[PDB]
Design a protein around this ligand. Sequence first.
Ligand SMILES: *[C@@](O)(c1nc2cc(Br)ccc2s1)[C@H](C[C@@H]1CCNC1=O)NC(=O)[C@@H]1[C@@H]2[C@H](CN1C(=O)[C@H](NC(=O)C(F)(F)F)C(C)(C)C)C2(C)C
Ligand SMILES: *[C@@](O)(c1nc2cc(Br)ccc2s1)[C@H](C[C@@H]1CCNC1=O)NC(=O)[C@@H]1[C@@H]2[C@H](CN1C(=O)[C@H](NC(=O)C(F)(F)F)C(C)(C)C)C2(C)C
Lengths: 306, 306
Amino acid sequence: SGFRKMAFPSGKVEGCMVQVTCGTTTLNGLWLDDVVYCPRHVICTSEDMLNPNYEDLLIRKSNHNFLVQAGNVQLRVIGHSMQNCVLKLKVDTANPKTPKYKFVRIQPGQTFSVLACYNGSPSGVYQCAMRPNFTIKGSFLNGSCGSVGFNIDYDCVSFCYMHHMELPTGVHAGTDLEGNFYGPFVDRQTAQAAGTDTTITVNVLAWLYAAVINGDRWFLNRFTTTLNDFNLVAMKYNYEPLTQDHVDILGPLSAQTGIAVLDMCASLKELLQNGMNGRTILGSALLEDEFTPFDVVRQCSGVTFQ
Amino acid sequence: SGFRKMAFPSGKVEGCMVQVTCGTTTLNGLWLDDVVYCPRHVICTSEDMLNPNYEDLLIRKSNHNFLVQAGNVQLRVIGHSMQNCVLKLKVDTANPKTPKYKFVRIQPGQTFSVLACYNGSPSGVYQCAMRPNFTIKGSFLNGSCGSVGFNIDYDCVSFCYMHHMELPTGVHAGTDLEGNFYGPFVDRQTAQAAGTDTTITVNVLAWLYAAVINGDRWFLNRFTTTLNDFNLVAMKYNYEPLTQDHVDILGPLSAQTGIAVLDMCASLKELLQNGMNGRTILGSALLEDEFTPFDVVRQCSGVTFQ
Ligand SMILES: *[C@@](O)(c1nc2cc(Br)ccc2s1)[C@H](C[C@@H]1CCNC1=O)NC(=O)[C@@H]1[C@@H]2[C@H](CN1C(=O)[C@H](NC(=O)C(F)(F)F)C(C)(C)C)C2(C)C
Ligand SMILES: *[C@@](O)(c1nc2cc(Br)ccc2s1)[C@H](C[C@@H]1CCNC1=O)NC(=O)[C@@H]1[C@@H]2[C@H](CN1C(=O)[C@H](NC(=O)C(F)(F)F)C(C)(C)C)C2(C)C
């Protein structure tokens, strides 16, 4: 029993982190096979960053201008190219610790683990959700750029996020590993703002199921609802719509607990209209939306990796 | 910016996890140098666990009754001894992935990362504290015993916790790596209840400092207090007493923010006497007590390892 915000074990990713330096700018890079991926603004100085012409900056660069360090191993760079907001440095050694991997673009609502790094070294690991406004509520300082987010499926690492920047309310934005931003952000130091965020409904429902599994049942009521009536209430509380796909994905938890998804929605509806009355659910005094249905299953069933 | 419950990178510990099997009982073991450490109740069947005579269970066994697996490979057990509530198996092969390490016995209020494991494989990583009542608020299922808790400082892993059992209300109990239980617990399936828990005051103050560093300053009030007067309020709210050692440990955060420790105590006092009135601090609707002063500085200054 117990329910915690749980990250994937970080070992397979730790063996892929390197330091990439160009001039006086250092950030993190990801070393997979014979390619090092990092944010393209490794080629900027803090003056350039205010308004960079990345193509113009890149023309003036050559292989030897890119210092790549993997622990104390200096890698020889033998090629470079830009792809969207990411640089790809070809190196002359394949990373012997490359795991099975793929690049994925995640959707809002989906969770992943971040391995926050400085100077090519791990600081820590924590779980994040891609918010509906395409930000993440991370913990990042200067130098964290190039840290990655990922999921593990048995032995396979799915990389979904590379860190680029922080937005006004101390939330974070970045790209997939093909260098395309999540959200309408750009890699420039100019005023930008996240849109209105909303609560990830399917996730809150998952977490209510985790609470039931743990014997925290006080919020179960005697009502049911319809998807359409539920969505009316959701939208007035700035919750995402619940779709049939969400219902389908909640099926394992539904079947495990014997609680119809629509009955749980009716319980959530009451919680939204009446508040929590200072009570807690799984230790929290707010409704938690950064656990996916899969996260709850993995945690409650003790799924392992590696 | 941002402030998250951050675990240590787990790669160093992932390389030490093995499975120990005695008869039909399998649990996790930790393989450091030529020794494997695991809960002594690996020598129990489900029937033995009501009131095991560990001496009698052990005295029958020989080296050969212990199966140690790392991946596919069997390690040859060439010695065994029981120390308190842990078994130590000497194997004929030193772990090639052994990190620099020490064993430490932590104090209530100190935090650590747990690498939850099943069948000798990692399931995930999360941060916990040693509660004042010597329990931890974990996430553990059947098969988790032998999972360990740790801190890293630079390249050195300090192991502090090995998982043994779950108490009522879904909280957890275990030993140091010398096999000595934290708190008054015993490794038998018998009526055991944790003492009333209290709130780690010094940690709440650290997190309030974290909040200020991140711009969340609404709770800074217009008062100060004395240690004596504050401690009267803490006692009333089942908070631990704050000592002068705690005030000293908060020195760095105090000096960084220009906010005297006693002024922060006074702000906390107000929070305790008035409640938070639905407000949040760092996204939490409750006062968080599972970040140490060191945790805050580590996170806010981006300390790395490895
Ligand atoms: C990152 O680690 C990087 N640092 C540098 C330093 C140099 Br000289 C070159 C390139 C990079 S990339 C940081 C990470 C962030 C610092 C604080 N917390 C973080 O998550 N990224 C940045 O500094 C990016 C970077 C430049 C500006 N910026 C920002 O994050 C910020 N945002 C914005 O200007 C705005 F769009 F408003 F949101 C900044 C510094 C927080 C004001 C670019 C986006 C390329
Ligand atoms: C652990 O993984 C172990 N499982 C086994 C199985 C066998 Br056949 C032998 C030895 C072990 S050690 C679990 C972990 C816990 C299960 C639920 N969540 C957990 O964290 N440990 C236990 O089963 C321990 C173990 C036996 C009983 N027990 C308990 O955790 C609880 N004991 C209590 O009665 C109490 F005192 F409350 F703490 C139990 C099973 C949850 C009722 C011993 C203490 C040796």
